[PDB]
């Protein structure tokens, strides 16, 4: 492999993470498992968390946490997986670029001084992680100031695989489509997550002008359900909205779409090659999870490791199921040094 043949850009996030109770979810008016953006209401829950809770701080973002991932399980060579998106001139700044380092992966950031950078709240309930990301210095990423210099474009241009969660077309939907159209124009392969049910329900004007570049769709069960409820699609059947999500419109008419949806420990549903297929998850001793928090980033970036190798579609869903089942037993959306995959 080449350097920088995986691009990502997205929000980069320190993730303040701790296992709370569902008195602490119910005060705050949280899902035990959902994925929000920070409300006012939401101040005190940050620093309720760091003084009565045990914290753990480590870098989140969920397309970072997928290009991290990916890089992880490529190995060689460094700097295979490119990262772009904002943080702020700080200390949390700091430790999200010391740990992209760590991570091998090429990170680029568009830094500023007046936001802090962004950060989420991962509270930890059994199986379950309630997200509440304060976007902050993420929310101020510039098209036209990063992503459109010559410097950072030629970095797009060396990619084969682009990967950007949902989550960034509360951003900038002009960047997703600006790479968007390029992969199409290129036949180079685009990839996206659903991420959140908010993104169906209120962003989806901009996810629905994404769409017809995307080559691979990933996304969860929720997610999936919320998607087919906004496009009216009704069905009782995570296959069918697979399905249906396969035959939407689409730019690109030389690649066929591949939908994936994971579904926590039920099997993992891929519509593509003519058919739907149910993947099982064989890893089910729950005793051993600690965090499902990063589940899906994960099983995202072992699935990308393996198709910018070229592998079969069996190959991409084991290693994403192997990452998810690595990232499940950790705090956050962290990893040991070494895959064994
Ligand atoms: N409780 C679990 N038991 C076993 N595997 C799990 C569990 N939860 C998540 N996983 C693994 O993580 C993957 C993604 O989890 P999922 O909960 O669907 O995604 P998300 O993190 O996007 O909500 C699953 O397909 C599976 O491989
Ligand atoms: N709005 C958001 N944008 C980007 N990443 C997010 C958002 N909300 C939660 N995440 C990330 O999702 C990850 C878990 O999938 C966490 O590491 C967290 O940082
Ligand atoms: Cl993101
Ligand atoms: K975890
Ligand atoms: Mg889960
Ligand atoms: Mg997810």
Same mark, same amino acid.
């Given at each position: 492999?080449?350097?920088?043949?995986?691009?990502?850009? %997205?929000?980069?996030?320190?993730?303040?993470?701790?296992?709370?109770?569902?008195?602490?979810?119910?005060?705050?008016?949280?899902?035990?498992?959902?994925? *929000?953006?920070?409300?006012?209401?939401?101040?005190?829950?940050?620093?309720?968390? =760091?003084?009565?809770?045990?914290?753990?701080?480590?870098?989140?973002?969920?397309?970072?946490?997928?290009?991290?991932?990916?890089?992880?399980?490529?190995?060689?060579?460094?700097?295979?997986?490119? +990262?772009?998106?904002?943080?702020?001139?700080?200390?949390?700044?700091? *430790?999200?670029?010391?740990?992209?380092?760590?991570?091998?992966?090429?990170?680029?950031?568009?830094?500023?001084?007046?936001?802090?950078?962004?950060?989420?709240?991962?509270?930890?309930? !059994?199986?379950?992680?309630?997200?509440?990301?304060?976007?902050?210095?993420?929310?101020?990423?510039?098209?036209?100031?990063?992503?459109?210099?010559?410097?950072?474009?030629?970095?797009?241009?060396?990619?084969?695989?682009?990967?950007?969660?949902? +989550?960034?077309?509360?951003?900038?939907?002009?960047?997703?489509?600006? =790479?968007?159209?390029?992969?199409?124009?290129?036949?180079?392969?685009?990839?996206?997550?659903?991420?959140?049910?908010?993104?169906?329900?209120? +962003?989806?004007? /901009?996810?629905?002008? =994404?769409?017809?570049?995307?080559?691979?769709?990933? !996304?969860?069960?929720?997610?999936?359900?919320?998607?087919?409820?906004?496009?009216?699609?009704?069905?009782?059947?995570?296959?069918?909205?697979?399905?249906?999500?396969?035959?939407?419109?689409?730019?690109?008419?030389?690649?066929?779409?591949?939908?994936?949806?994971?579904? %926590?420990?039920?099997?993992?549903?891929?519509?593509?090659?003519?058919?739907?297929?149910?993947?099982?998850?064989?890893?089910?001793?729950?005793?051993?999870? *600690?965090?499902?928090?990063?589940? %899906?980033?994960?099983?995202? !970036?072992?699935?990308?490791?393996?198709?910018?190798?070229?592998?079969?579609?069996?190959?991409?869903?084991?290693? !994403?199921?192997? /990452?998810?089942?690595?990232?499940?037993?950790?705090?956050?959306?962290?990893?040991?040094?070494?895959?064994?995959?």
């Amino acid at each position: 492999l080449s350097e920088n043949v995986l691009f990502g850009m %997205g929000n980069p996030l320190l993730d303040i993470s701790a296992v709370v109770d569902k008195d602490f979810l119910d005060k705050y008016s949280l899902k035990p498992n959902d994925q *929000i953006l920070a409300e006012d209401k939401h101040k005190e829950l940050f620093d309720e968390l =760091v003084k009565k809770f045990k914290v753990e701080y480590h870098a989140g973002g969920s397309t970072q946490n997928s290009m991290k991932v990916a890089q992880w399980l490529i190995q060689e060579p460094h700097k295979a997986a490119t +990262f772009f998106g904002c943080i702020g001139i700080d200390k949390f700044g700091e *430790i999200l670029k010391r740990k992209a380092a760590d991570a091998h992966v090429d990170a680029h950031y568009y830094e500023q001084n007046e936001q802090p950078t962004g950060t989420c709240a991962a509270c930890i309930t !059994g199986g379950n992680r309630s997200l509440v990301a304060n976007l902050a210095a993420a929310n101020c990423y510039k098209k036209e100031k990063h992503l459109d210099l010559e410097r950072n474009w030629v970095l797009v241009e060396k990619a084969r695989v682009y990967y950007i969660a949902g +989550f960034f077309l509360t951003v900038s939907p002009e960047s997703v489509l600006k =790479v968007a159209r390029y992969a199409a124009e290129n036949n180079r392969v685009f990839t996206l997550n659903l991420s959140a049910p908010f993104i169906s329900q209120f +962003f989806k004007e /901009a996810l629905m002008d =994404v769409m017809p570049y995307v080559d691979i769709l990933f !996304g969860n069960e929720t997610e999936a359900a919320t998607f087919a409820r906004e496009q009216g699609f009704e069905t009782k059947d995570i296959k069918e909205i697979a399905k249906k999500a396969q035959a939407l419109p689409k730019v690109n008419s030389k690649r066929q779409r591949t939908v994936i949806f994971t579904q %926590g420990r039920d099997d993992t549903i891929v519509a593509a090659e003519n058919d739907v297929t149910a993947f099982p998850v064989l890893d089910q001793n729950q005793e051993e999870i *600690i965090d499902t928090n990063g589940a %899906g980033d994960a099983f995202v !970036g072992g699935f990308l490791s393996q198709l910018v190798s070229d592998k079969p579609l069996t190959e991409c869903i084991r290693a !994403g199921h192997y /990452a998810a089942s690595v990232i499940i037993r950790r705090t956050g959306c962290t990893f040991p040094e070494k895959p064994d995959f």
